[PDB]
Amino acid sequence: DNTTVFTRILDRLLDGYDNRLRPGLGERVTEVKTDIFVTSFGPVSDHDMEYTIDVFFRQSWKDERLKFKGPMTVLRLNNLMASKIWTPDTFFHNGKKSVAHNMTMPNKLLRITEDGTLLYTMRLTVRAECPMHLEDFPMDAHACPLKFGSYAYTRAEVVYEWTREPARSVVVAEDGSRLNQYDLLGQTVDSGIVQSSTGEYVVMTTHFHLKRKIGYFVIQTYLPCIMTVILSQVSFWLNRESVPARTVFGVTTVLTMTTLSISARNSLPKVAYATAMDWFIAVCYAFVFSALIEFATVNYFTKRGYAKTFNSVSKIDRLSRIAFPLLFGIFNLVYWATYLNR
């Protein structure tokens, strides 16, 4: 009738069809052409060393048993046909928890052409491992990978290819950036062979080059250390006899610095080494705690309890009014040129 001509085409395609066997099981290798359309590169979790990515993962392969001759060259079908045909067992090697979306229907695509060439697109949100080396935190850059390949079929059975040029086979969408801490610099693909206990498997790598934007850790920690050190520098311009004022000055600057040291290591994991921000934290601790030792030396070397023989201005404070701000100022030009410039 009207759609009976296509019904007897689909029922002829699926008659005597075994979806347990790959196309050309005993005669050839089932090549799979792959491209990824990244619709949103999601947030990167520093604490869990992971990242999120929403894709339009496409696979294409040739099936010799799905050839038809009809009034339509392409059969743009729904997803019930996809479960009744052979589809490759592509899985993500460094994935942690991925979701194939199915609201309101399963987000899949299936387009058989008249010679058997298939196209299989899916919506996935892949949470993948991005191992990080945070020795230059927060002025660091990472290359978060995304490896995928077959699970059961080895290199002699199913090989994977990019359908376009490899520089153009991973396309990130224009608005596809849910990144608020990093910014994506560019994608980078590679293809290789990985060996396991079962056999050798073709793996397709996609590296996403990320760079952290220091916009937050300035206002958050760097500038409170600068204001805490420059705060603890003006205690030398106070009176020599003023013991409670400079005493509470030193102890409150030490408390603000030692609570900056605690809050500094949050939302990044408990790594064994020390970051660049931790070295900065150590120096803005040293240049606060060295002021109070100077004040203790002055208080040991001071005399009468008023400001008759009046007291004299300390020589220790006059050098510390000049040496301590410049030894801070030389350090910041050394620290920021070492890490931020390279």
Epitope: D115, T117, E161, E165, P166, T188, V189, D190, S191
Partner: antibody
Framework: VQLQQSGAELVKPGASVKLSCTAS????????MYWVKQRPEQGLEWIGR????????KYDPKFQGKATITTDTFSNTAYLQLSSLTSEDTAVYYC???????????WGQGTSVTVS | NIVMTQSPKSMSMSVGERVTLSCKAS??????VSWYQQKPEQSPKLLIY???NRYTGVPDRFTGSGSATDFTLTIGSVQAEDLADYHC????????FGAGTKLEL
Amino acid sequence: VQLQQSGAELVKPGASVKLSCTASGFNIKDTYMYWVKQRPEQGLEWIGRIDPANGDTKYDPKFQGKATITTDTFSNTAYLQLSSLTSEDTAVYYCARKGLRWAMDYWGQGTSVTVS
Amino acid sequence: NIVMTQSPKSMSMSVGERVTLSCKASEYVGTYVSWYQQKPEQSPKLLIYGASNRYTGVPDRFTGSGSATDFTLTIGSVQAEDLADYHCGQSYSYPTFGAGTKLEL
């Protein structure tokens, strides 16, 4: 499994020449078809790209305009169109099948063009 | 574009020793280079695909090697019938080629 090209061509400069190669043993709808230029005592220069299942073509920016690539399905054949031939276009041309891991597997025997 | 800068122009050694080539890439091509031989009056034949993958019919003496940017092709005990010209390509982007390394006695 065999890529058979046309014969040698000798035309005057400024004219146009049709150049072709027929692919056998497979179908050109699967793999990409590449064109490449080999000057005498020089290296290879890639001409352009064509996707016969799609019709999409991509060209070298130094070869844009003066050359275009066409194809057809029934004859399983790729074609070259060359316009405004000069002295530096005197070279030998090959058509390349895209193979395993984008490697230019098969090559034609080579058609050499000559201007005078 | 991607510029292939394979060196040197020609190597002149005898038969029965190890000879290596080199191909430097301007930008990243990741294990997508290829090596072809060019006999006089002959179409090119593929030798290595990927970075170091021996094609069918290639003898075992032809051992390539690859990386992200630096590439090389090592020949062990080169014979007299290998006296041809060698080309270096890439296909990570739109394909380019090198100048060409020849062999001499």
